[PDB]
């Protein structure tokens, strides 16, 4: 996983990427890490902030960071966004605060890997890149 997420404490992984338990029903498009609302989200990989959105839908408050030539890391369900568009960010820079914005049951951060663009196709962060 060349761009797998490596959140430390207090982030705890809850729902994996891909088809959920059983053979029918839902498909998680990223990896959910649980943590209290307000927990600062440190960026996993350096890149350019080229996508910021506030909505009450799906990922809700989220940022996209271009972390590779054709790969964008998305950090979602924020309670507060702290990156501005154009920001060059380093790994471990705090890009936001955990929330439950959008379509999330409780407090967690949704890490999604997209190819083709900030609204592009999602991939498996655990496996993409090796
Ligand atoms: Zn999710």
Author numbering: 2 to 131
Task: Give me lines lifted from the publication on this model.
Despite multiple attempts to crystallize and solve the EnpACD structure, we were unable to obtain crystals of the wild-type protein diffracting below 4 Å; therefore, we generated an inactive variant of EnpACD H109A. The crystals of this variant gave better diffraction data that were then used to solve the structure of EnpACD at a resolution of 3 Å. The crystal structure revealed five protein molecules in the asymmetric unit (ASU). All EnpACD molecules in the ASU are similar with root-mean-square deviation (RMSD) values of 0.35 Å–0.65 Å and β-factors for chains A–E ranging from 87 to 108 Å2. EnpACD is a globular all β-structure molecule that could be divided into two β-sheets. A central β-sheet creates the bottom of the active site groove while its walls are restricted by three out of four protruding loops, as loop 4 rather sticks to the protein core. The organization of the active site is conserved among the members of the enzymatically active peptidoglycan hydrolases from the M23 family, and a strong electron density corresponding to a metal ion was observed in the close vicinity of His29, Asp33 and His111, residues coordinating Zn2+. EnpACD substrate pocket is placed on the plane of the central β-sheet, and its walls are defined by loops that build a deep (10–20 Å) and very narrow (4–5 Å) groove. In the EnpACD structure, the Arg21 side chain is in close contact with Ser16 and Asp27, suggesting the formation of the hydrogen bond and a salt bridge. The EnpA broader specificity is achieved by opening the binding groove at the prime site making it more accessible for a wider range of substrates.
EnpA is a prophage encoded 1721 residues protein composed of three domains; the N-terminal domain (1350 amino acids) shares homology with phage tail tape measure proteins. The two domains located towards the C-terminus of EnpA are homologous to domains belonging to PG hydrolases with lytic transglycosylase activity (cleaving glycan chains) and M23 peptidase activity (cleaving PG peptides). The functional analysis of the EnpA catalytic domain (EnpACD) revealed its hydrolytic activity on the D-Ala–L-Ala bond, which is characteristic for E. faecalis peptidoglycan, and proposed the minimum substrate of EnpCD to consist of three residues of the donor stem and the amino acids of the cross-bridge. Members of the M23 family are metallopeptidases containing a zinc ion in their active site, coordinated by two histidine and one aspartic acid residues in the conserved motifs: HXXXD and HXH.
